[model samples]
Target chain A: TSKIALFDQTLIASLLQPPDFKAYKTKVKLKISEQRNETSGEKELKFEISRSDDFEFLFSETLNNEKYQILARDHDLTVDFDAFPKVIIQHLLCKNIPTEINIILDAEKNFCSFELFSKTPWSKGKIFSIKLHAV
Target chain B: TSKIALFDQTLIASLLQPLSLNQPDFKAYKTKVKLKISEQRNETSGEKELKFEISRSDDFEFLFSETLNNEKYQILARDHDLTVDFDAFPKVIIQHLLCPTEINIILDAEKNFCSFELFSKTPWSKGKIFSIKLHAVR
Candidate 1:
């Protein structure tokens, strides 16, 4: 039998307006998967996400199952972007998205990817648009 | 982004006396999950799986995620019986299964275990039986 793979991921969230939740919709194109030593080994993820000012995760569907693996044996994982949020919403424009989070999986054999999605952000006649792209 | 990596996987199948209706099944378990550094990043998995002469089910899932910090991370995930048999052949001792086979996600980082579900299997057939034993704390 073979072994499990390792995967790496990166994300950057941005909107047209600074610190303004009611700004033009935001679209993020992130890599969802990568290749490993194993043949035909891959991951498929397509989701839109939204968070409250209180740093609460909002699921897009009726069922909430967005839990992800952080790290493991030989398989290492790290999640960054936890920049110290400023009290003023204006800090949103400081999209100086820190840097790419890096994780070093242990095994000489691993592959990984990052997947994201979103939900309803607009109200009644809200034309809030969200885009997701991967390379 | 770290360079991608390589991984291996295992797949198993347990069928009944004959391929009557849907009496066969399949399942994939990780005998091992190897990883290469500067490559793959993170992964996490959790799924409730159980099989009969039991085959397969998508009840079990795994994970291996990562952050943008070139730090050595550790990601651990596991999948049980996959709730295989009972879901289908409730009256017979056969199964058909298909595991993710061998999925290798390479990365290195710190992680936390928050949730998990367990599964089991009991074959009710008069075929050659194999006994399995476990050892305490390796």
Candidate 2:
């Protein structure tokens, strides 16, 4: 459990407020995974979102291999990239190794968590997890 | 005096509400102009804008020129159509035109009104004006 605070905690807390949490409750789990091609060595990022009914997860790839923007909207809720620290952006943009990001809402625990996994040369398989509880 | 509502009048009204007849109160104005050029049998489209100090505006030409995810942003322009994700904002698009359209803005004689002029031909020799006046909030 790495304690690196990569995201703006206040912003995440605000995002988990009543109105936005209600909007995102349907799709509470967001997972972004990165993998490298076995033969070609090309990197690919995949987005997997869990839906409300049956909790089924759907996967999709980035369009045109472009970099992700700082803002994303799912129906009514908007996720602004300004919530991410510069170091996290740099880490996400690192192409030397694959990385993964997971955003989950733990209703039972009453907390929303953000986890980042990057296989850096220094990490030795360590994962950075940052969690924020809604106020 | 044609009354053409190109923008959301309610939004404009809200934007002007704070300034309400106060002197030295700051107000921002933004205008985008598209011009059609014809020179020696060659025709091309040109874009221009008049910007003020306090206005918040962005040009998509630089953003799309680089590698970016288009879906996340609210405003996107592709080919000849400029689309806004929000319903309140109007979309500027060109379907079929022999000549590109040009827009010119003119402040009224008393400075309390403004008009928009649309020209369909080069040299901007002819066009129609759509005017609106600024009224105090009741």
Candidate 3:
């Protein structure tokens, strides 16, 4: 229903000591679609997210599907911290070396807590912490 | 979190428009809601209580209450308890209802909008009419 930007994931990552990927120079476009009924309405979100380093490789990911939880915190729609890390880690592993990554968000049915499942590039399913946000 | 029930869709559709397919037996009851926080309201000091009521004719109303810790307030928080008190109802009325109706609430922070899903869990029931009171402990 409105426009939003993914807060600097790179800065957040680096602050915590992982791979602080370089911040994107430009803002990622965010879109929202509203679906309604007599009882309820849902706001779907779509956006582009990516990660990269000194620059060698790059990949783009879309936050589409019955994906992650987008919290209506104040005026901003933030990716819940619970799912925040997984979002960054997925991008981090994209390069055993320097690289670039991006993520976009779209919507579907079902909105609740933030939790996403993927085989994971680095974790391999042995079980590690990862997070995702959706509507 | 509020206690909400997803209303049966087939029955609701039957109540509204008709479909050629057989009515499903499943209880698909719920009002999908998308509400926005009013632009005037902000996080530091914003509107705290929101109200939504839906009736038989698909008529509905939404309100944002200025009072804090009021009824019908489901906060957007974790590690907090949400409770609805029926203090306004008389003992006789409160004693008669067996179940509470369920509803969904969504907050539109930017615009201060709230959408609600309204329904009762018990089959063929309108549920008891009662005021809502909420309390969240830090």
Best by TM-score: 2
Q: Which stretches of candidate 1 lie over 4 Å from their true place?
A: A1-135, B1-21, B27-138
lDDT of 3 by residue, B16-50 (tens): 11122354233333443322211122356554333
lDDT scores in order: 0.22, 0.30, 0.28
lDDT of 3 by residue, A1-135 (tens): 243443333321211111342323332222222222223333333332333542312222233323443232221223443344334345443231233222222222111121112231111121122233332
Writing each residue's lDDT as its tens digit, candidate 1 over A20-134 gives 2232233332222212324444332223233244223222211011222321111211221121111101222123222221111112212212221121111011111222221
TM-score of chain B of 1: 0.16
Query: For model 3 chain A, where is the 10-residue window of minimal lDDT?
Result: A120-129
**Per-residue alpha-carbon lDDT of candidate 2 for residues B1-138, written as tens digits (9 for 90 to 100):** 122223221111112212444553545454433322111111232222111111113422211011112331222223212233322112212222211444444433334443333333311112221112222111
Q: Could you give candidate 2's per-residue lDDT for residues A14-130 as a string of tens digits?
A: 123342454232323343445554555554443333434543233233211223331122111122233333434454524322555445566553564554544322122213344
The CAPRI class of candidate 2 is: incorrect
The regions of model 2 sitting more than 4 angstroms off are A1-25, A51-55, A58-135, B1-138
lDDT tens digits, residues B12-106, model 1?
A: 32211222235333232343322111223233322222211111244233232222221111111111111223223211211221221112121
